[PDB]
Amino acid sequence: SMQAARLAKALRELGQTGWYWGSMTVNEAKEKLKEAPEGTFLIRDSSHSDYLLTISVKTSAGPTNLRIEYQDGKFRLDSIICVKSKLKQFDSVVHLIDYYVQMCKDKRTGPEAPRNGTVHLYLTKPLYTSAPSLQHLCRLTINKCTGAIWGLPLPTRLKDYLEEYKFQV
Amino acid sequence: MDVFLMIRRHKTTIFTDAKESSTVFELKRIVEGILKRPPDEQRLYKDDQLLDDGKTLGECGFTSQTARPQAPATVGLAFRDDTFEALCIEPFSSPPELPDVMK
Amino acid sequence: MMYVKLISSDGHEFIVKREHALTSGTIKAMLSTNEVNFREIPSHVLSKVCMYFTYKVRYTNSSTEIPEFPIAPEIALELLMAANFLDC
């Protein structure tokens, strides 16, 4: 299926992040986030039967957790927290994260909670499981500079690499 | 604790690390193993200032926060026949101009 | 043998611990003389590569929070090609 193909790719991108912690319990995430600055986040498998993945993030009050939903080929933040029309849907979960990160980088969202009940996710920097490759670190930097990788002075083989992961986080 | 450094002379750079409590003399002992020049034939600098052999790197200013593995602090190195040479560090090549798309 | 010497195309020599140099898959093939001459990698790129060897070795585990590796936009094209040449 074109659905199953998009989900395989979603999971492929996730393995590229360096901040996917796989099977990690909520209490291991709470320990690993305890001393981190506000907004530090990771993604990990959900221990819940109906959810694939969970975001764990440091707030000023300590680590908290937010599940990610997958329904009919699309990812969104758990619809328990808000009406679904306010929870943007994505084909890839790294793209979902990238969006919320760019939202805060662009100061279109801050650590203060909104008063009108819309979505309040303050994310700054990921928590890496290990040092990612130097290739990937360069890819992250080129993604933060431009989205037009096909006009770059680069061999086609390395543009295919940049195309496999277009995110800024 | 750990301090990460580039020890530089002319066109030579050593990537090494030390402890913030390590002495300057301990640093020169590292240089000797790799460059085979005895410690008394060595002078080490932070910027344009000579470093007393008995100080710790900390008391010279090399903190962990300022000497990270991804951004090591630079130590200059000058060798001694009768005279000690001038401290001289050859710069790296300069990067090309950023392509327009990326500006 | 505890260290290896890496030489850029403009003649800069970089002395780094041999264990560090092995993070590069390309270097590990040759080494596993004690010098390697990169005749197409300039010093502004090669110095940053060596910093990455340090950072990679220090931060394999996660008992320390892994900080960010800063990469100026101006080297990132060349750094990409070097990183792909060295396979790290």
Ligand SMILES: CCc1cc(CNC(=O)[C@H](Cc2ccc(OP(=O)(O)O)cc2)NC(=O)Cc2ccc(F)cc2)ccc1F
């Ligand atoms: C700012 C992020 C955010 C959060 C919310 C509300 N969130 C929750 O009330 C979550 C539910 C929850 C629990 C566990 C879990 O993990 P999972 O079962 O999926 O593995 C997934 C979700 N409660 C906790 O975090 C409490 C907790 C923290 C640390 C710990 F050690 C144990 C428990 C709404 C909007 C938001 F934007």
